[PDB]
Design a protein around this ligand. Sequence first.
Ligand code: J2N
Length: 222
Amino acid sequence: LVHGGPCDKTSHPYQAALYTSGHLLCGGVLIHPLWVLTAAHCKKPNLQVFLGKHNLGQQESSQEQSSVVRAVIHPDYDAASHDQDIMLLRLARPAKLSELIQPLPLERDCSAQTTSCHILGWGKTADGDFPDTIQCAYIHLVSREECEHAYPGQITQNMLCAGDEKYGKDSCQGDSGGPLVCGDHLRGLVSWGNIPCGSKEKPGVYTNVCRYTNWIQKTIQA
Ligand SMILES: N=C(N)c1ccc(NC(=O)[C@H]2CCCNC2=O)cc1
């Protein structure tokens, strides 16, 4: 995350850190004690999910670790265009809920009214380095027309755009799969964007979670 600041310790109980080969790969969101929501391009071998983390470099009393028993990618995911970039992860051990581990409710209404949005993650910072402490930033949703002018013919209905006009606060490398939180509800997932990271003119592109409510529900209860 570029141009942000460390989060408050108790403000991110839904955040998951995804690891492969012993190294941080992606972000994720706890949506049920048995399920984590992330991006389909985060599909790597033998995925390790860590809940209740704040500082990656330190061992914390609040943290829980689980391996993945089932990885469910959306049937219509197209890797080249990033369309329908969503994946469900079944935990081997269901999450032991606490003050620092809780699920986040999803946004069901695609025509949901204006709320305050924020992004969070352990992705690359402004200096080009990986932080130990999780980063946070407030951003605003960018109109569909404004986004189609930034990325001609690359924006589908399964994507949302968001950014910060003043500083260019944006998600970055290592944030993929993380949440776009609008009004205490999951509104989107980190999918793709401008490299080098910065949202002043080309906003970040996120998976539009409101479109996948029925698919998410059918997968969990399958
Ligand atoms: N500028 C942006 N908004 C933005 C958002 C996400 C990325 N994603 C990555 O680089 C990927 C690579 C594959 C695994 N993990 C990642 O995070 C880039 C830019």
